[PDB]
Amino acid sequence: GLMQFTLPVRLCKEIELFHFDIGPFENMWPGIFVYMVHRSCGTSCFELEKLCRFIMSVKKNYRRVPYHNWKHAVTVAHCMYAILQNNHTLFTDLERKGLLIACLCHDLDHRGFSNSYLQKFDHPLAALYSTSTMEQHHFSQTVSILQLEGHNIFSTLSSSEYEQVLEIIRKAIIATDLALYFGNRKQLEEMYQTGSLNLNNQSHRDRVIGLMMTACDLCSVTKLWPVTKLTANDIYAEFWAEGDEMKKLGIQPIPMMDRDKKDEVPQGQLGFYNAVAIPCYTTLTQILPPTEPLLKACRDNLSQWEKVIRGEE
Ligand SMILES: C[C@@H]1CCCN1C(=O)c1cnn(C)c1C(=O)Nc1ccn2cc(-c3ccccc3)nc2c1
Ligand SMILES: [Cl-]
Ligand SMILES: [Mg+2]
Ligand SMILES: [Zn+2]
């Protein structure tokens, strides 16, 4: 109980910033995550023995894929940690608990393929969950790990608090389905502008938490340029493997997934920053002003991709 996690001074300072990179030392990521739960939530909110056992079961259930891996899980949780810490009073004790866990678990047992590829392959998961296929699986896996003996980090919550947290986590994980992000952000844009946004309206909280999840999930675009650029290699390694599998089914994949159209990556990054990332962090900054450093970092990286196109790198 009087056992803090401490980090070396550089990490202790930099972990508080939106652009923190969790480093190449895998064995420190669990400690980094417990550090964030302790500072974000209290040293009390989970029994260490149970938390540490949930963390290692979650790690074990991420696969060795280029991008949708254990590093991604902890990176996304850290972004959520930065948002919660910069918006201290806006969130309930239960939301802070559930959202860090939601982020850690949001891509559990990802195989490196899109919902589209599951459906065209006719994977069993596409029969079981007709929309947000992988995201319903991720939530299902989360619940299965919570039910292993010694793994219920939420044991000390009341029955109603327990149903509340698992409902926060389910919505948070489903919101990471980027097909749902576009409509969710439009509605938030409309509600912010017409001044109808009400953080006491549960369905309004839900939409805002959904935009936070999209923001945390896309956070490679808010890092220092070299992190952003090297993460993009990992993203394309999955995209192009999926394209290869599309060609095996006799289907010409979208250019995003076609390693033959590697040349046009820079222009594809502009499209993504303009269509997805910039609007996402803009609406998030409007709703939560202290998350502006994500929008500012995203704009800097857009400007770096523009320089790649102009042959300056
Ligand atoms: C939703 C999935 C799950 C994994 C993250 N994700 C993302 O979308 C995602 C998350 N972070 N980042 C940086 C991306 C990303 O790079 N996204 C995109 C989006 C559209 N594109 C089109 C083209 C293109 C390339 C060559 C030629 C022509 C086009 N490249 C892209 C890249
Ligand atoms: Cl604090
Ligand atoms: Mg996902
Ligand atoms: Zn993700």
260: domain CATH number is 1.10.1300.10
Residue 203 class from Cβ within 10 Å (0-12 exposed, 13-18 middle, 19+ buried)?
Answer: exposed
- Method underlying the structure: X-ray
Helix or strand or coil: residue 30? helix
Q: Has residue 8 been placed in a domain?
A: no
Q: How far is the CA of 269 from the centre of ligand 1 (A)?
A: 7
Sign of torsion over alpha carbons 11, 15, 17, 20: positive
Residue type, 125: L
Residue 9 belongs to some domain of the structure: no
Residue 19 lies in a domain: no
Q: d(Cα 253, Cα 257) in Å, to the nearest integer?
A: 6
17 assigned to some structural domain = no
Is residue 131 in some structural domain?
yes
* 181 C-beta closer than 6 A to ligand 1: no
Overall resolution, Å: 2.2
d(CA 256, CA 262): 8
In a domain, 4, yes or no: no
Determine contact, residues 1/7, Cβ cutoff 8 Å. Answer: no
Query: How many angstroms separate the CA atoms of 207 and 140, rounded?
Result: 21
Indicate the number of domains in the chain.
Answer: 1
Decide: 268 in ligand 1 pocket, CB within 6 A: yes
CA distance 57 to 53: 6
Q: Measured from the CB, is residue 272 less than 6 Å from ligand 1?
A: yes
Give the range of the structural domain holding residue 271, as residue numbers without chain letter: 28-310
Catalytic residue positions, numbered: 68
Q: Is residue 233 part of a domain?
A: yes
Q: Which is nearest to 83 in space by CA: 231, 232, 227, 217?
A: 217
Closest CA to 66 of 121, 122, 113, 132: 113
Most ligand 1 atoms within 8 A of CB, residue of 133, 221, 256 to mutate: 256
> What is the distance between the alpha carbons of residues 287 and 289, in angstroms, rounded to a whole number?
6
CA-proximal residue: ligand 1, atom 11 (nearest): 218
Give the count of beta carbons closer than 10 Å to the beta carbon of residue 51. 19
* Ligand nearest, relative to CA of residue 84: 2
Establish if 11 belongs to a structural domain.
no
The alpha carbon of residue 101 and the mean position of all alpha carbons in its chain are separated, in whole angstroms, by 11
